Amino acid sequence: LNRESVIDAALELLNETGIDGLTTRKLAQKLGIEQPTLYWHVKNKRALLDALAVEILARHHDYSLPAAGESWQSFLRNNAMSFRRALLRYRDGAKVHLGTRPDEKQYDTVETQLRFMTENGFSLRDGLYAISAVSHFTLGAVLEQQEHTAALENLPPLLREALQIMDSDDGEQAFLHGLESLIRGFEVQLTALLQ
Amino acid sequence: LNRESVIDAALELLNETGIDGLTTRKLAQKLGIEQPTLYWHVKNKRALLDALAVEILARHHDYSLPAAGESWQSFLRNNAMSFRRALLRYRDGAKVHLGTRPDEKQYDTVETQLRFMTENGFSLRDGLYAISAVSHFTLGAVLEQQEHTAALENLPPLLREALQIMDSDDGEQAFLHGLESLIRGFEVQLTALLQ
DNA sequence: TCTATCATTGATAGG
DNA sequence: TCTATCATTGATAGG
Known part of the structure; x- marks a missing residue:
């Protein structure tokens, strides 16, 4: 269960609860894991958000x-x-x-x-x-x-x-x-x- | 010490610590008061931020x-x-x-x-x-x-x-x-x- | 306009 | 990749 799969459940959580309901604890529960484990996969929330930004563009902004x-x-x-x-x-x-x-x-x-x-x-x-x-x-x-x-x-x-x-x-x-x-x-x- | 004076120390605190260091507790200390008292003057932080927005425009956006x-x-x-x-x-x-x-x-x-x-x-x-x-x-x-x-x-x-x-x-x-x-x-x- | 007192939430020790 | 365990922070009871 990579950092790749973390950034995924995170994009699903963004579309669900918006940029503010996107809380570490809600993400963990999505990934079936426990909270401080996400800190293994991501440096911190900011790092995670930059991740999502890049991910969105890379995923849709083809032109x-x-x-x-x-x-x-x-x-x-x-x-x-x-x-x-x-x-x-x-x-x-x-x-x-x-x-x-x-x-x-x-x-x-x-x-x-x-x-x-x-x-x-x-x-x-x-x-x-x-x-x-x-x-x-x-x-x-x-x-x-x-x-x-x-x-x-x-x-x-x-x-x-x-x-x-x-x-x-x-x-x-x-x-x-x-x-x-x-x-x-x-x-x-x-x-x-x-x- | 009005809500008018609260929205003031708040604009000073914005120019100091930015939108994120603008915390209720730092504001109170600026106003020489105690934290939950600000809740007498402002409904909540969001209300306070809208206050600052309007205040900025009203204060400078003449045209x-x-x-x-x-x-x-x-x-x-x-x-x-x-x-x-x-x-x-x-x-x-x-x-x-x-x-x-x-x-x-x-x-x-x-x-x-x-x-x-x-x-x-x-x-x-x-x-x-x-x-x-x-x-x-x-x-x-x-x-x-x-x-x-x-x-x-x-x-x-x-x-x-x-x-x-x-x-x-x-x-x-x-x-x-x-x-x-x-x-x-x-x-x-x-x-x-x-x- | 002060006193507990919380609940939410990001994060680190420590292994 | 789990267990305490925190520190920061917005907010409400209660008068």
Whole structure:
């Protein structure tokens, strides 16, 4: 019963009780074992949470790299949609992710993304900023959609209808809309530099 | 020694020990009082954290509303910069904010922002989506800048220089750059509808 | 606004 | 991979 099987029952426990009901003792009982034994498998809870973050991405975030011949617009779009989709598969996934320090084992993936931007028109900073903007927006978005989904009158007109809209989707179209907003903003800034 | 003075020593304790060292017992000692007395002033810790969130914004986020005759571009820009600047004044400010449910006492401010968009070209959803995108990006950005600032080799070329860039600013220019990226994306989508 | 007094929870000794 | 055994910490009885 590995550390691999521990990080598994942990992801099941995340989807059950959320990031706060995910307590050492509940995990042990899931693994049929006794509490301080988990300390054999994991350094500590923080270590365990970083584990889950990496695990989620590795497990669902397939589109980390640009396909051959793909436009930056299409990459950024595809990457962000894969990113968000990974976070959304687990309860509190975005929060769990936010706590983790960036993974050293993906240094190569990161650098390839950077290079890809320089080759499609961007200087280094503009590619950095472009990629950063996209993941910041995507993060903020999933965090909110997830906090809205969870949480377990006399609203003014516009607001009333507005909540009804986000309520419809969960935020999907809102997200897809802000994504394109960023890309079009990147296009217009690029053709403004070439100009 | 009010609940007003409690929420004060609490903001001082946030800037000292961060969102995690902010423990009931440390707060009491700051207030020269004994622990369970704080329970007279505050319902519970969550209630206290929402208190701090509202307090931070009320205290620094002045630009919540558009000035008379201001362009949407200028509002969104000014609002986001004020928002981020408020979060940045307190350690873990963005995290503290993220936990809070939206304030009922700002229903009027929200609705005025919505109306302002319909009057400057946007339908309801597009104004909603535009305003949402801006605060999602701003949130994701401050959250990261704050986690990067806190936390208390053989990096590949591009990445090495990239970290050096974000390290220079703390993320400021990165932020200001993504902000304009969103706005220009909004402009181009608006003139694409009128078209 | 103080006094016990808890219950939950992450973690280490110790083998 | 189990046995005490803690220390930190949020919270309620009870007046």
